[PDB]
mmCIF file of C-alpha atoms in Angstrom:
data_model
loop_
_atom_site.group_PDB
_atom_site.id
_atom_site.type_symbol
_atom_site.label_atom_id
_atom_site.label_comp_id
_atom_site.label_asym_id
_atom_site.label_seq_id
_atom_site.Cartn_x
_atom_site.Cartn_y
_atom_site.Cartn_z
ATOM 1 C CA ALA A 1 76.506 120.915 93.855
ATOM 2 C CA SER A 2 76.280 122.712 97.024
ATOM 3 C CA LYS A 3 77.599 125.857 98.486
ATOM 4 C CA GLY A 4 79.915 123.903 101.119
ATOM 5 C CA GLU A 5 81.548 122.575 97.978
ATOM 6 C CA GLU A 6 83.135 125.793 97.349
ATOM 7 C CA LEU A 7 85.000 125.788 100.824
ATOM 8 C CA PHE A 8 87.011 122.982 99.517
ATOM 9 C CA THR A 9 88.976 124.508 96.503
ATOM 10 C CA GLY A 10 92.781 124.511 96.917
ATOM 11 C CA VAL A 11 93.994 123.371 100.112
ATOM 12 C CA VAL A 12 92.461 123.430 103.437
ATOM 13 C CA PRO A 13 94.461 123.040 106.889
ATOM 14 C CA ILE A 14 93.216 120.254 109.092
ATOM 15 C CA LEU A 15 93.058 119.539 112.797
ATOM 16 C CA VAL A 16 92.248 116.483 114.360
ATOM 17 C CA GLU A 17 91.812 116.062 118.237
ATOM 18 C CA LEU A 18 91.132 112.761 119.724
ATOM 19 C CA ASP A 19 90.510 111.832 123.367
ATOM 20 C CA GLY A 20 89.838 108.082 124.003
ATOM 21 C CA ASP A 21 89.639 105.632 126.851
ATOM 22 C CA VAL A 22 90.091 101.956 125.924
ATOM 23 C CA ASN A 23 89.521 99.424 128.819
ATOM 24 C CA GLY A 24 90.465 102.425 131.101
ATOM 25 C CA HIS A 25 93.586 103.237 129.369
ATOM 26 C CA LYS A 26 93.038 107.074 128.489
ATOM 27 C CA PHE A 27 94.957 108.666 125.836
ATOM 28 C CA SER A 28 94.842 111.893 123.490
ATOM 29 C CA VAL A 29 96.165 112.380 120.051
ATOM 30 C CA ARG A 30 96.504 115.537 117.999
ATOM 31 C CA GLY A 31 97.101 115.388 114.351
ATOM 32 C CA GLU A 32 97.643 118.453 111.672
ATOM 33 C CA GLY A 33 98.043 118.711 108.026
ATOM 34 C CA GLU A 34 96.085 119.608 104.922
ATOM 35 C CA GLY A 35 93.400 118.245 102.586
ATOM 36 C CA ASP A 36 93.074 118.668 98.675
ATOM 37 C CA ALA A 37 89.578 117.481 97.786
ATOM 38 C CA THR A 38 90.095 118.371 94.247
ATOM 39 C CA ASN A 39 92.553 115.272 94.248
ATOM 40 C CA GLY A 40 91.145 113.415 97.082
ATOM 41 C CA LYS A 41 94.513 113.857 98.880
ATOM 42 C CA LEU A 42 95.250 114.029 102.544
ATOM 43 C CA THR A 43 98.692 114.470 104.313
ATOM 44 C CA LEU A 44 98.299 114.300 108.124
ATOM 45 C CA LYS A 45 100.912 113.550 111.063
ATOM 46 C CA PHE A 46 99.438 112.550 114.479
ATOM 47 C CA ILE A 47 101.240 112.547 117.718
ATOM 48 C CA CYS A 48 100.093 110.956 120.950
ATOM 49 C CA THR A 49 100.113 113.911 123.419
ATOM 50 C CA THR A 50 99.680 111.557 126.478
ATOM 51 C CA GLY A 51 103.149 109.455 125.999
ATOM 52 C CA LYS A 52 102.609 106.136 124.157
ATOM 53 C CA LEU A 53 99.483 105.032 122.653
ATOM 54 C CA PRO A 54 97.723 101.806 124.295
ATOM 55 C CA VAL A 55 96.273 100.522 120.976
ATOM 56 C CA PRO A 56 97.944 100.132 117.668
ATOM 57 C CA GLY A 57 97.961 103.373 115.535
ATOM 58 C CA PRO A 58 96.509 101.608 112.761
ATOM 59 C CA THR A 59 93.183 100.949 114.670
ATOM 60 C CA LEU A 60 92.591 104.728 114.785
ATOM 61 C CA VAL A 61 93.267 105.671 111.130
ATOM 62 C CA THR A 62 89.622 105.509 110.304
ATOM 63 C CA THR A 63 88.493 107.385 113.392
ATOM 64 C CA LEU A 64 91.191 109.943 112.840
ATOM 65 C CA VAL A 65 87.400 113.664 107.394
ATOM 66 C CA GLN A 66 85.441 112.131 104.398
ATOM 67 C CA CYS A 67 84.697 115.770 103.163
ATOM 68 C CA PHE A 68 87.940 115.641 101.715
ATOM 69 C CA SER A 69 86.852 112.590 99.387
ATOM 70 C CA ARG A 70 87.316 113.557 95.401
ATOM 71 C CA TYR A 71 83.811 113.267 94.083
ATOM 72 C CA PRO A 72 83.820 112.998 90.149
ATOM 73 C CA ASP A 73 81.907 115.521 88.100
ATOM 74 C CA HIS A 74 78.736 113.423 87.632
ATOM 75 C CA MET A 75 78.436 112.421 91.430
ATOM 76 C CA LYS A 76 78.884 115.700 93.053
ATOM 77 C CA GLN A 77 75.096 115.813 93.753
ATOM 78 C CA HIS A 78 75.911 112.925 96.165
ATOM 79 C CA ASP A 79 78.657 114.695 98.218
ATOM 80 C CA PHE A 80 76.833 114.941 101.634
ATOM 81 C CA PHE A 81 79.956 115.783 103.596
ATOM 82 C CA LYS A 82 80.981 119.096 102.030
ATOM 83 C CA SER A 83 77.170 119.822 101.543
ATOM 84 C CA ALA A 84 76.753 120.138 105.334
ATOM 85 C CA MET A 85 79.790 122.643 105.450
ATOM 86 C CA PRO A 86 80.681 125.124 107.112
ATOM 87 C CA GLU A 87 78.381 124.079 110.061
ATOM 88 C CA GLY A 88 79.605 120.484 109.662
ATOM 89 C CA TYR A 89 78.404 117.052 110.855
ATOM 90 C CA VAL A 90 78.576 114.369 113.756
ATOM 91 C CA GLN A 91 80.012 111.333 112.673
ATOM 92 C CA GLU A 92 79.055 108.376 114.840
ATOM 93 C CA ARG A 93 80.746 104.669 114.774
ATOM 94 C CA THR A 94 80.787 101.394 116.112
ATOM 95 C CA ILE A 95 83.859 99.442 115.111
ATOM 96 C CA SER A 96 83.492 95.868 116.053
ATOM 97 C CA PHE A 97 87.060 94.099 116.231
ATOM 98 C CA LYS A 98 86.470 90.378 115.502
ATOM 99 C CA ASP A 99 86.849 88.161 118.553
ATOM 100 C CA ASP A 100 87.951 91.236 120.506
ATOM 101 C CA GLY A 101 86.698 94.514 121.889
ATOM 102 C CA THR A 102 84.548 97.382 120.374
ATOM 103 C CA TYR A 103 85.422 100.952 119.851
ATOM 104 C CA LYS A 104 82.597 103.455 119.928
ATOM 105 C CA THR A 105 83.109 106.934 118.553
ATOM 106 C CA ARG A 106 81.552 110.481 118.345
ATOM 107 C CA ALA A 107 83.261 113.128 116.289
ATOM 108 C CA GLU A 108 82.177 116.719 115.257
ATOM 109 C CA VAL A 109 83.669 117.523 111.686
ATOM 110 C CA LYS A 110 83.334 121.445 111.113
ATOM 111 C CA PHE A 111 85.073 124.506 110.077
ATOM 112 C CA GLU A 112 86.410 126.519 112.963
ATOM 113 C CA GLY A 113 87.656 129.881 111.323
ATOM 114 C CA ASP A 114 89.491 128.309 107.977
ATOM 115 C CA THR A 115 90.622 124.928 109.696
ATOM 116 C CA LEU A 116 88.897 121.867 109.081
ATOM 117 C CA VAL A 117 88.425 120.252 112.568
ATOM 118 C CA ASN A 118 87.689 116.681 113.427
ATOM 119 C CA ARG A 119 87.145 116.409 117.306
ATOM 120 C CA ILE A 120 86.311 113.026 118.421
ATOM 121 C CA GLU A 121 85.597 110.983 121.628
ATOM 122 C CA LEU A 122 86.397 107.281 121.460
ATOM 123 C CA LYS A 123 85.655 104.768 123.952
ATOM 124 C CA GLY A 124 86.876 101.342 123.862
ATOM 125 C CA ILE A 125 85.146 98.095 125.667
ATOM 126 C CA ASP A 126 85.859 94.262 126.201
ATOM 127 C CA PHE A 127 89.244 94.129 124.857
ATOM 128 C CA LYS A 128 91.697 91.265 125.551
ATOM 129 C CA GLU A 129 94.667 92.249 127.462
ATOM 130 C CA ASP A 130 96.609 89.584 125.399
ATOM 131 C CA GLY A 131 94.667 90.208 122.204
ATOM 132 C CA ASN A 132 95.659 92.002 118.961
ATOM 133 C CA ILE A 133 94.886 95.285 119.836
ATOM 134 C CA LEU A 134 95.923 95.927 123.752
ATOM 135 C CA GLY A 135 98.888 93.239 123.080
ATOM 136 C CA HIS A 136 100.045 95.129 119.992
ATOM 137 C CA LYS A 137 100.302 92.584 117.379
ATOM 138 C CA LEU A 138 99.140 94.383 114.480
ATOM 139 C CA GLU A 139 101.797 95.522 111.719
ATOM 140 C CA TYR A 140 102.372 99.033 111.040
ATOM 141 C CA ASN A 141 100.915 99.352 107.546
ATOM 142 C CA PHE A 142 97.181 99.788 106.020
ATOM 143 C CA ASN A 143 95.389 98.246 103.366
ATOM 144 C CA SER A 144 92.806 99.870 100.744
ATOM 145 C CA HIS A 145 89.289 99.406 101.534
ATOM 146 C CA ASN A 146 85.634 100.626 100.172
ATOM 147 C CA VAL A 147 83.294 102.638 102.257
ATOM 148 C CA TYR A 148 79.750 101.706 101.421
ATOM 149 C CA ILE A 149 77.303 104.819 101.938
ATOM 150 C CA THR A 150 73.515 104.848 101.759
ATOM 151 C CA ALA A 151 71.308 108.240 102.401
ATOM 152 C CA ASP A 152 69.286 108.297 105.684
ATOM 153 C CA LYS A 153 66.939 110.415 104.876
ATOM 154 C CA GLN A 154 64.987 110.461 108.207
ATOM 155 C CA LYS A 155 68.271 111.992 109.675
ATOM 156 C CA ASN A 156 68.877 114.388 106.968
ATOM 157 C CA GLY A 157 72.250 112.527 106.874
ATOM 158 C CA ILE A 158 73.767 109.125 105.721
ATOM 159 C CA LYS A 159 74.949 105.868 107.113
ATOM 160 C CA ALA A 160 77.804 103.844 105.964
ATOM 161 C CA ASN A 161 79.189 100.008 106.401
ATOM 162 C CA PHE A 162 82.547 99.048 105.655
ATOM 163 C CA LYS A 163 85.047 96.093 106.842
ATOM 164 C CA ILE A 164 88.805 97.230 107.567
ATOM 165 C CA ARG A 165 91.459 94.217 107.513
ATOM 166 C CA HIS A 166 94.376 95.202 109.885
ATOM 167 C CA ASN A 167 97.508 92.871 109.138
ATOM 168 C CA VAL A 168 98.724 90.781 112.054
ATOM 169 C CA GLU A 169 102.287 89.963 112.674
ATOM 170 C CA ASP A 170 101.480 86.180 112.722
ATOM 171 C CA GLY A 171 100.168 86.508 109.037
ATOM 172 C CA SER A 172 96.620 86.666 110.083
ATOM 173 C CA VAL A 173 93.992 89.705 109.512
ATOM 174 C CA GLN A 174 92.251 91.429 112.268
ATOM 175 C CA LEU A 175 88.772 92.362 111.018
ATOM 176 C CA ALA A 176 87.294 95.613 112.066
ATOM 177 C CA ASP A 177 83.719 95.946 111.158
ATOM 178 C CA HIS A 178 82.622 99.481 110.909
ATOM 179 C CA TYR A 179 79.058 100.957 111.330
ATOM 180 C CA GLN A 180 78.678 104.581 110.821
ATOM 181 C CA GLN A 181 76.246 107.260 111.002
ATOM 182 C CA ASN A 182 76.562 111.080 109.973
ATOM 183 C CA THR A 183 74.175 113.917 110.530
ATOM 184 C CA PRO A 184 74.361 117.313 110.071
ATOM 185 C CA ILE A 185 75.043 120.040 112.590
ATOM 186 C CA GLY A 186 73.081 122.696 110.891
ATOM 187 C CA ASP A 187 69.778 123.276 109.773
ATOM 188 C CA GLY A 188 70.152 123.999 106.207
ATOM 189 C CA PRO A 189 69.612 121.614 103.287
ATOM 190 C CA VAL A 190 72.332 118.979 102.379
ATOM 191 C CA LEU A 191 72.686 116.669 99.488
ATOM 192 C CA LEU A 192 71.366 113.205 100.257
ATOM 193 C CA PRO A 193 73.131 110.529 97.924
ATOM 194 C CA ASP A 194 72.254 107.702 95.819
ATOM 195 C CA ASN A 195 74.084 104.401 97.028
ATOM 196 C CA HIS A 196 77.645 104.702 96.389
ATOM 197 C CA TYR A 197 80.981 103.977 97.658
ATOM 198 C CA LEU A 198 84.316 105.938 98.669
ATOM 199 C CA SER A 199 87.487 103.978 97.529
ATOM 200 C CA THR A 200 90.253 104.529 100.151
ATOM 201 C CA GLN A 201 93.971 103.975 99.830
ATOM 202 C CA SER A 202 96.321 104.791 102.682
ATOM 203 C CA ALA A 203 100.122 104.778 103.404
ATOM 204 C CA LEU A 204 101.555 104.989 106.698
ATOM 205 C CA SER A 205 105.048 106.083 107.493
ATOM 206 C CA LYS A 206 107.267 107.354 110.363
ATOM 207 C CA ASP A 207 109.311 110.118 110.586
ATOM 208 C CA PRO A 208 112.809 109.160 111.262
ATOM 209 C CA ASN A 209 113.745 112.082 113.500
ATOM 210 C CA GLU A 210 110.671 112.058 115.819
ATOM 211 C CA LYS A 211 110.915 110.430 119.120
ATOM 212 C CA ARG A 212 107.308 110.925 120.137
ATOM 213 C CA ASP A 213 104.604 108.301 119.556
ATOM 214 C CA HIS A 214 103.258 109.092 116.080
ATOM 215 C CA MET A 215 101.947 108.358 112.492
ATOM 216 C CA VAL A 216 102.464 109.978 109.281
ATOM 217 C CA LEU A 217 99.717 109.245 106.785
ATOM 218 C CA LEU A 218 99.076 110.000 103.157
ATOM 219 C CA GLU A 219 95.454 109.155 101.785
ATOM 220 C CA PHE A 220 93.828 109.347 98.441
ATOM 221 C CA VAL A 221 90.077 108.868 98.339
ATOM 222 C CA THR A 222 87.717 108.747 95.331
ATOM 223 C CA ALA A 223 84.035 108.339 95.329
ATOM 224 C CA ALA A 224 82.757 105.753 92.810
ATOM 225 C CA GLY A 225 79.692 103.554 92.298
#
């Protein structure tokens, strides 16, 4: 166990702020909601604050707080994410869309007062203007995935790799290969885990009364392996 674990009892409010630039198309997203790590449950609504998103919302889900994962009792010594709190951690990814461009992300995940904040900068390059991403050919839905985690002792953090499968309107699947690294912001001791994975399930919806470009998300995440 860790002291940071105690910050996640009950429900914790969440704020997500993303500034993005994909092939020169700049955009911002703001998300708000709550997380219940006891149940591995997240509920969030995201709005684009710059009009219409220039990429499909589903391509941003993984970028838009793994500290809310449910770690079963025998696995709590392997929960790096909560152990880094409240000072938090930097989460960096490369997301390589097969036959298309790449996202590079850097986020800081930390408590600001009683709110768990995820603040992200995203850059996208080498996208095809008529591809699945800039051409908005991805379905508005999300599959279940496993996030494979290993310790990175030299950085006092973790790495992860996983594949996201985005359904395409033509019945194909757009692969997005994810490379992830997380490093603590503070200098305190953290939990460095044995190899394991996070089993993620996500459901996307829309608010019928909402005219802004938005996404409603419900997620359940449980550590295993």
